[PDB]
Design a protein around this ligand. Structure first.
Ligand SMILES: O=P(O)(O)OC[C@@H](O)[C@@H](O)[C@H](O)CO
Ligand SMILES: O=P(O)(O)OC[C@@H](O)[C@@H](O)[C@H](O)CO
Lengths: 557, 557
């Protein structure tokens, strides 16, 4: 088997689930224990707002939580965490440290990789970012015709795109005095084309974001941007005023036409999906200002310290991790829904699709043995209240068990109409988890049908359709306000949740070998699409699709 | 039990799956039979472009497909379809017809509800839409200060939002000479606030989209918009120049204060999640023009006729539906991924999240029995290639089986760099499904690592992580170009897929009693948030969360 399934605390947990889980009913759990919310929630005081992690509406008893905490301990979570924080090369398949926590290490306590403290270089690049932010935001940095920059365009994909996009979206109210920010990511030429259409070469600065600086998508997009720019500027020396790089490839960066002084470096121990805290977050810092960027880092640092110092039984990311293990490995739930009741957070779910799924969508353990159990879930969601009208039908009355995290700020950035909108938003946030837990009993629906004037025949027919089984578990995560600091803490919380789950599964949360095959096969297909000659080199489906493409590409509609 | 599980053809199918499914290997199926693509694909000629539905990379044989078609006949799919198209009241819980097909019935063949042809009223509303679009788009329609309209704002949620949003996004290239379009949907005050900040009351036209015209989010947003408007206009008669309604509720529209001639009617047999084809599509028609809206309707009509007249074994929506049944009810896959290789299609997956999940996230059958089998899947996805750099890691190397539909137009709307971007996009589209099918055997990975120069030690350490198990089934849906017509055909195709699955599960695809409950939920909590007094009326979690909101709402950050 694998490490997890061979673990006696896991075996005990699974056996307990088999014997007892049918006895777990949320309604009864709350009725039996008025201290339930008190015992199954964490009210975190960060000194910059509170984060309440309410996990009480979960299918767990005190005994289940105890078993889960014991499993985290017996899977080596505490030791593994310490190894991450100390710079051990815990990314074992690539032999790399995993040090996104160093990027936001505000305390400046030394963190060594190969005997050398990484903090000086972290802080050097942060200083460079700050200076660049002053130059651009003040208008001192001029374009090729001597005008201030009005638009920043990040070009990047995956980890070089999602974090900066999600965070600038989430922190939009903090962007007064900042340039507009645009994100180009898809190779689909629609993306860059529609972006450039609304821009002036005179006042636009491009940020080329690539860990490797070889990703075909990003480099192609970057070269398209440069071609468009040079059409107007007609001077290759002007490129240095309008293009900067987030990478380490000094030669290719210089060859591109970017001043080596405008390469913002990061390191191999910064995973792409953990990179917004590094140089990769330059578009964030430009948009909301460096002070706000530091606040974002400080919130993450607070959560790092919470994760590092707190006993597991009261440790927020650990508890979130453990509830997920319970639903994944015991109940067999494929998915995890992230439902922020916040329009600014509209890209939060998409961000953690990479963060979670690229981390823990794995099947090989540290020993090299295949897992014989589930790993990472499929992450999904849209902001409330919209989902209530879209897919909550299935959550309430479908045939899937779907753990959901509901998230909301107490204070809105836009308290319009004396707080009316936010009052309604909050009421929906609360009522939905309440309804998911409670459902609606036959006796309740029956009386409603009788009051509505339904005939005995119609009532009988309609009744089962109007009943809600309930017993659908949720987390409610509520926080004072979505400030840069609080957002930083929340992202870090999920980062550490993902880490804990990965350790427990005995997988590598920090590599991504699964992207290689698709890349290989695409490089082979690319040149074959040119010209009218038949392609016969693949399976008949791939060949047939290529044939269709060749046949249909000249058709006038 | 339930109709599906009681069905002998289903039990036959499932027994076959038990005994034989482990012997289906895609790589081997393709090697053994060069005709596989030909035997498991449909090349549809619409006379306005081709749609290739290539289902050959699925874990199916001739025998499997035979059994699935036989099950569809046994479950009465054809009869149910005919009943929908004839105006039978197949939404049995609400006693309503289900006639989105009437909305786009270009033939004008009578479709009767209660002995009355619905087509005259369908066409009367379409003619009203056409006339209105001409007046606004031409600049003839003037605001309260005598200026042409520059911005249109749709206010609606769920079915009154997602269709118009998705389609205007997908058909963006067709919007030259149309007003800018905005979508406000969330009750979250951020949504309306940030929209209004960018608008002038003098040149903005609001479209209040709501079937019932009582939905809290929509009516509140509408009232906020009206208050903002009237603060500038200071004249109730000016509202008629700036507010129109799309609804079935004449009285509530009048009550809100909208001109009777400013109401675009639809009917109870138009489901919200099937409503973009009706008056609800006004924002589409305003943005891209009525002619393009008519093309969209015409594409849907073509697909309707395909569904109606084609033998099950060559019927595109039927086959997609049956492959879904196979993966859901035999393999137990919770989810279905929609992955369009098209940035304009970036809201397509979210749209069918509603269309699918709100339709088929059900657990009561026509007979009143609780299902003892799975119903609708969780639908999710992001456009390619971004997905590859977000979550494809899990699709390739996770522990979940995930049926994926890959979609792409052959012709791009933006053939920049002499088609270089689209070449790369197509290459990735093709390679990914090839990769998911083929995988990479241990011996194949071994040879690659050996050629890379890895020592016996390093090779052995890395090997298992580099293996791709493959056998991951996909659909590839390729179409000449994403025109209004082709988009219409594609949406209708999935609508009918959803219909077929619903009939086979014996559920009502057309009600939403879970959604209706939602609209009854927040009302009790709303007044309890006002004031400083402690709430003790609910379970301790709801109480505790309310206490947190009250404690945290005055804190200064
Ligand atoms: O930052 P570069 O090297 O372009 O790579 C982009 C993505 O492929 C990368 O983030 C990947 O998803 C791993 O996190
Ligand atoms: O259109 P109204 O009645 O406002 O309803 C909004 C949504 O609840 C509705 O579209 C729902 O998504 C059902 O399809």
């Amino acid at each position: 088997m694998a490490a997890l399934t061979r673990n006696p605390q896991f075996q005990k947990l699974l056996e307990w689930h088999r014997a007892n889980s049918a006895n777990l009913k949320l309604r009864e759990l709350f009725e039996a224990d008025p201290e339930r919310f008190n015992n199954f929630s964490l009210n975190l005081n960060t000194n910059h707002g509170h984060i309440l992690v309410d996990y009480s509406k979960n299918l767990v008893s005190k005994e289940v939580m105890q078993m889960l905490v014991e499993l985290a301990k017996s899977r080596g979570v505490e030791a593994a965490r310490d190894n991450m924080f100390s710079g051990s090369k815990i990314n074992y398949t690539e032999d790399r440290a995993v040090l996104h926590v160093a990027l936001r290490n505000r305390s400046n306590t030394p963190i060594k990789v190969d005997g050398k403290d990484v903090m000086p270089e972290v802080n050097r690049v942060l200083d460079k970012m700050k200076s660049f932010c002053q130059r651009v935001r003040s208008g001192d940095w001029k374009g090729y015709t001597g005008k201030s920059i009005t638009d920043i365009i990040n070009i990047g994909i995956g980890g070089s795109d999602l974090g900066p996009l999600m965070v600038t979206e989430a922190l939009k109210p903090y962007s007064k005095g900042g340039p507009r920010v645009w994100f180009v990511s898809n190779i689909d030429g629609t993306h860059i084309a529609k972006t450039l259409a609304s821009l002036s070469p005179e006042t636009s600065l491009f940020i080329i974001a690539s860990k490797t600086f070889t990703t075909q998508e990003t480099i192609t997009n970057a070269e398209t941007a440069k071609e468009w720019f040079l059409e107007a500027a007609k001077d290759p020396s002007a490129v240095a005023k309008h293009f900067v790089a987030l990478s380490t490839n000094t030669a290719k960066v210089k060859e591109f036409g970017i001043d080596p002084q405008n390469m913002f470096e990061f390191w191999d121990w910064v995973g792409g999906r953990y990179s917004l805290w590094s140089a990769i977050g330059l578009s964030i810092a430009l948009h909301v200002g460096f002070d706000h960027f530091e606040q974002l880092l400080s919130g993450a640092h607070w959560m790092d310290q919470h994760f590092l110092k707190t006993p597991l039984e009261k440790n927020a990311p650990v508890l979130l991790a453990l509830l997920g293990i319970w639903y994944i490995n015991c109940y067999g739930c494929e998915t995890h829904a992230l439902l922020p009741y916040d329009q600014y957070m509209h890209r939060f779910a998409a961000y953690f699709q990479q963060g979670d799924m690229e981390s823990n969508g794995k099947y090989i353990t540290k020993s090299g043995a295949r897992v014989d159990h589930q790993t990472g879930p499929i992450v999904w969601g849209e902001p409330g209240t919209n989902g209530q009208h879209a897919f909550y039908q299935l959550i309430h009355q479908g045939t899937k068990m779907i753990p959901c995290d509901f998230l909301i700020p107490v204070q809105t950035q836009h308290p319009i109409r004396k707080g009316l909108h936010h009052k309604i938003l909050l009421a929906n946030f609360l009522a939905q988890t309440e309804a998911l837990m409670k459902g609606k009993l036959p006796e309740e629906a029956r009386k409603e049908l009788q009051a509505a004037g339904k005939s005995p025949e119609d009532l009988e027919k309609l009744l089962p359709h109007k009943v809600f089984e309930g017993n659908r578990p949720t987390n409610s995560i509520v926080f004072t306000k979505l400030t840069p600091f609080i957002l930083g803490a929340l992202i870090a919380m999920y980062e550490h949740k993902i880490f804990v789950q990965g350790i427990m599964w005995d997988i590598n949360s920090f590599d991504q070998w699964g992207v290689e095959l698709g890349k290989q096969l695409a490089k082979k297909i690319e040149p074959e699409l040119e010209g009218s000659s038949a392609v016969t080199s693949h399976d008949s489906s791939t060949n047939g699709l290529i044939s269709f493409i060749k046949q249909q590409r000249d058709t006038k509609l």
